[PDB]
Design a protein around this ligand. Structure first.
Ligand SMILES: CCN1C[C@H](C)n2c(c(O)c3c(=O)n(Cc4ccc(F)c(Cl)c4)nc(C(=O)NC)c32)C1=O
Ligand SMILES: CCN1C[C@H](C)n2c(c(O)c3c(=O)n(Cc4ccc(F)c(Cl)c4)nc(C(=O)NC)c32)C1=O
Ligand SMILES: [Mg+2]
Ligand SMILES: [Mg+2]
Ligand SMILES: [Mg+2]
Ligand SMILES: [Mg+2]
Ligand SMILES: [Mg+2]
Ligand SMILES: [Mg+2]
Ligand SMILES: [N+]
Ligand SMILES: [N+]
Ligand SMILES: [Zn+2]
Ligand SMILES: [Zn+2]
Lengths: 180, 368, 368, 180
DNA sequence: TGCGAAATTCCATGACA
DNA sequence: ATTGTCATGGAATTTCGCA
DNA sequence: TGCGAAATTCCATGACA
DNA sequence: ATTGTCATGGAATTTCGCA
């Protein structure tokens, strides 16, 4: 069995609805399996159309051999199937209702929630820095960040301040005022 | 003046006037019998005015000016007086063309890493497509890897929006560009400083300085053209296709695609290279670091036989950038303050500002 | 196809496939173990389609196309199949640049007499001056002697009015010009025929062909510029001054002014040459006939190392004259009917018209 | 004494009034003394202004050392004197009321009169051919035409048909109908 | 029959839309 | 069934003034 | 240890407003 | 106080297949 590589498998998934930001509500999340590198895309809906529009941008930089997702409607549509077939991408689905990627996805949700407090509406603009944070974050398992593994070099934005990622008592009470 | 010419008439010797010729008075003027015929020797005090008259007929250079003068006059060292005048004719100096070539180009070292330096530029305006007219082209210096963004204008704000999308992936140390309004605005500088990015500018009107991106523009337009043959010029939907197409094209001198130089492995694109299938990613990245350091680097070419190279304190003239019809192509003479390298200089422009300037937009002022 | 590849698998020898390599089946495909790794050998019937896929990714030339293919495949003589395809890609052929230079220029003989040939052209539009915008420039081929006429438009009628004033002095055998609308109109042809004048046209968009007048345009603009420095661009009143000034200027290689070549004696202008004061007019005209025949004539320069020269029956492509944005710079291939000289040809353009054309507006079609 | 040359002396004079042609009424006549070459200029009046405007065209091709004329007002004005002085031209006047040039001037008047019959109004357009005729006309005294003497070559318009220059019985009666 | 310096010739460079 | 040209000013080469 | 032909490298040409 | 570049396709040179 040949070793795991970048572009072997992209894991995609939607996050949202979120509070409106520049008219956007969701985030398409793409994580490369091998490097753990994350790309994020703001969408107005978790539809096949929004997915294609978003992945079209990504696939003009790099094309995965395999896309993996859950059985979200956007991903199981025949339009999405046709789109993938045109690009020679194999689609892969986890069975309904049930490592490195799973952890990364957790970090994203948690990192997002920590920043949409006091400014639940300014996240559109924050996406670039979210990604840079995520991709220049040290991996405990491998000795390297996703940046390092994708490009084979150090980054010019090392995030040496490994941030709390937890909610302070200020934010815990400010988040329970948000729902109210 | 009349003193020198007196001694001359009464047979005495004066330095410069060969003694072996017969000098005489006639019509109240000192003459001499030269092999080409009889010429008047005007007094020294008359000479400057004569040269000026000759030169001004058509603002002729050395020989054509001399040939007019020699028709009527002789005196010692005529051309020295001609040259003296040419060097003082503002109209000739700012209008004539140079007849000296620049020294040979520099071939600066390839940036060492991806993301060390971006070269950026706009192409356009192009035919309208979905309401877009321009393309922002961003070229990574080390890899040649390129990003394309359609815009409605070559503006700071469209540049800022595009670069925010790009810099989501990685932040570069330096972004290098020409002095287009989009890149020199203070709004863009704040955007750069905010992110630790140093802005570097080419000397004005010298697109060779950032030749990497300029050359990529050519390939972009070339591929767009081929794809649009026999169809209407709807290029907007083609940008992504062109980006991907070019990033995965081999440079025959390099034997690599920009994508390969960026990632060290092909993605799922047609004819993906399979050579490192059995290496681990770590082994692959190790071979990559090695490939990156051993890329062909061109060398500085031989100088042309009549090149000039700048010297501190030399008088030089900047090329007028957008000369109006019937106006001079050259600015007034200025002075080389510093020679940054044999192809770039700082000049003081008579106003007098400091300007950093390409040798290709300079000529050395003639006749000192 | 599958036949050839069958023999190959069972150890038999086929021409082109080196016997010293191990050929096998795997995943239902014929493979081979080459020093660079294992490649698929597609059947002959598959190959054209593969090359096409490779080429079309970015419409790459020989090596870049080959490098894609070699990633997955090997078969005998790959580049021959690559080249075959490049030669059939209409988009590549009409869009790519030439990489061959024209053969060295011709230096045609100077017309033998004043009035044998006029070269004419328009300069403009210039800034408005007294309501005039253009200059008709008429250059006598033998003498360089030049006539200037201000016009409101580069039209036949303004050309006709000006040439009527000029031809009051003398009628030329030939008038040579580019294919501007003013000179190709039937009205102008009738005007020429009426007076025994033969019209000769340069090949289209090749101003070098009538380089004498083009070069004189430069001097005219240069002198106008110098004279207008620091004033508003009121050039109309300067035309006569420039005419006179230039006609009485020495060519340093010739040692004569165009006026001298025309008349054999200076008129009453500053620094008039007095050398023939003692000759009779008849003796003067005799020396003139002699001076006219012994003028320096330049020779054809050495060819560049990668020049091409036209051959009857060769496929060549005319340069598109005014290519729109994102459109090819070259016309579809055409055929050389006749080689008029090594720098000029007649082609049949696929429509198919005869067109006489400069080699400088041609490239040889690549890959035969 | 050095031999006679082109541009040594231009002889000028006015002819007219003539019948209007394109609003022009006079002809300024310029004959080079040595070659006998003729230049003609249509004017609206025999004034110093019209003379300067005309000679400005000629003197942008060739400048005479001396201009000779009769004491016509246009030539004796101080404006004309100033004009000549600026160009380094010496002015020369024949005494009031009293060779090659004189003959040429006769030919011009006679040639003009022969052509302004049946078309007394179309002479403006005929000036070019008048000049070419005059300048490619053989000189009995010298062996050469003015063209040949000015340029040192044969012309591409030789006028081998040395025309009558006389009035036919048709033109004699058609000229006495013109005055009537 | 040879020196130093002036004169002349040579010629690459660039611009004619 | 047509075609480069030539001012320019440093450099290279030749000629001049003198001996 | 040397041949003919294929493969590879070399590199002038031209175009990025 | 900065800096040309690189696809292209014939030609030149090197390597390959074989002996
Ligand atoms: C307004 C700021 N600005 C300044 C000038 C206008 N400029 C800008 C450009 O992007 C380009 C450009 O791409 N090219 C094409 C070209 C020509 C020759 C070459 F060698 C290369 Cl490497 C490229 N030319 C110019 C120019 O200077 N024309 C005279 C140019 C620019 O943005
Ligand atoms: C419409 C008919 N027509 C055709 C073209 C437009 N054309 C006409 C001209 O007079 C010129 C002209 O002077 N130059 C300047 C130039 C450029 C390079 C040179 F080597 C030389 Cl000797 C002269 N260029 C062009 C031209 O072809 N530009 C692309 C030109 C003309 O009248
Ligand atoms: Mg989901
Ligand atoms: Mg630009
Ligand atoms: Mg550019
Ligand atoms: Mg023209
Ligand atoms: Mg022209
Ligand atoms: Mg009179
Ligand atoms: N460098
Ligand atoms: N010829
Ligand atoms: Zn001047
Ligand atoms: Zn193609």
């Amino acid at each position: 069995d040949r070793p795991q590589k970048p572009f072997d498998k992209f894991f995609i998934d939607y996050i949202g609805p979120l509070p409106p930001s520049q008219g956007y509500l969701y985030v398409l999340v793409v994580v490369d399996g091998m490097t753990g590198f994350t790309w994020l895309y703001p969408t107005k809906a978790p539809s096949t159309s929004a997915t294609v529009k978003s992945l079209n941008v990504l696939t003009s930089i790099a094309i995965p051999k395999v896309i993996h997702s859950d059985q979200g409607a956007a991903f199981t549509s025949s339009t999405f199937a046709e789109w993938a077939k045109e690009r020679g991408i194999h689609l892969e689905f986890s069975t309904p209702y049930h490592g490195k990627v799973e952890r990364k996805n957790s970090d994203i949700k948690r990192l997002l929630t920590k920043l949409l407090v006091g400014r639940p509406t300014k996240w559109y603009d924050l996406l670039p820095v979210v990604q840079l944070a995520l991709n220049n974050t040290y991996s405990p398992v491998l000795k390297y960040t996703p940046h390092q593994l994708l490009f084979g070099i150090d980054s010019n934005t090392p995030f040496a301040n490994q941030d709390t990622l937890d909610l302070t008592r200020e934010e815990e009470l400010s988040l329970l005022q948000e729902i109210r | 003046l009349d003193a020198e010419l007196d001694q001359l008439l009464q047979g005495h010797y004066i330095k410069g006037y060969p003694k072996q010729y017969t000098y005489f008075l006639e019509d109240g003027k000192v003459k001499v019998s030269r092999p080409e015929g009889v010429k008047i020797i005007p007094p020294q005090s008359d000479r400057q005015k004569i040269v000026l008259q000759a030169h001004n007929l058509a603002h002729t250079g050395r020989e054509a000016t001399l040939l007019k003068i020699a028709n009527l006059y002789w005196w010692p060292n005529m051309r020295k007086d001609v040259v003296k005048q040419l060097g003082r004719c503002q109209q000739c100096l700012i209008t004539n063309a140079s007849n000296k070539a620049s020294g040979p180009i520099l071939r600066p070292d390839r940036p060492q890493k991806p993301f060390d330096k971006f070269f950026i530029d706009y192409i356009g305006p192009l035919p309208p497509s979905q309401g877009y007219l321009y393309v922002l082209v961003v070229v990574d210096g080390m890899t040649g890897f390129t990003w394309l963004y359609p815009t409605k204008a070559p503006s700071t704000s469209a540049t800022v929006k595009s670069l925010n999308v790009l810099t989501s992936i990685a932040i570069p140390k330096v972004i290098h560009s020409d002095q287009g309004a989009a890149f020199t605005s203070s709004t863009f500088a704040e955007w750069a400083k905010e992110r630790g990015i140093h802005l570097e500018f080419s000397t004005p009107y010298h697109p060779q300085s950032h030749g990497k991106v300029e050359r990529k523009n050519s390939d972009i337009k070339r591929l767009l053209t081929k794809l649009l043959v026999g169809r209407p010029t709807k290029w907007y939907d083609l940008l992504p296709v062109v980006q991907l197409a070019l990033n995965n094209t081999y440079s025959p001198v390099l034997k690599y695609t920009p994508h390969q130089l960026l990632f060290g492995i092909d993605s799922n694109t047609p004819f993906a290279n399979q050579d490192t299938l059995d290496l681990t990613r770590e082994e692959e990245l190790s071979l990559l670091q090695e490939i990156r350091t051993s890329l062909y680097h061109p060398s500085t070419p031989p100088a042309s036989s009549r090149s000039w190279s700048p010297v501190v304190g030399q008088l030089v003239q900047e090329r007028v950038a957008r000369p109006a019809s019937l106006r001079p192509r050259w600015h007034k003479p200025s002075t080389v303050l510093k020679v940054l390298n044999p192809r770039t200089v700082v000049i003081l422009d008579h106003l007098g500002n400091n300007r950093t300037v390409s040798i290709d937009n300079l000529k050395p002022t003639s006749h000192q």
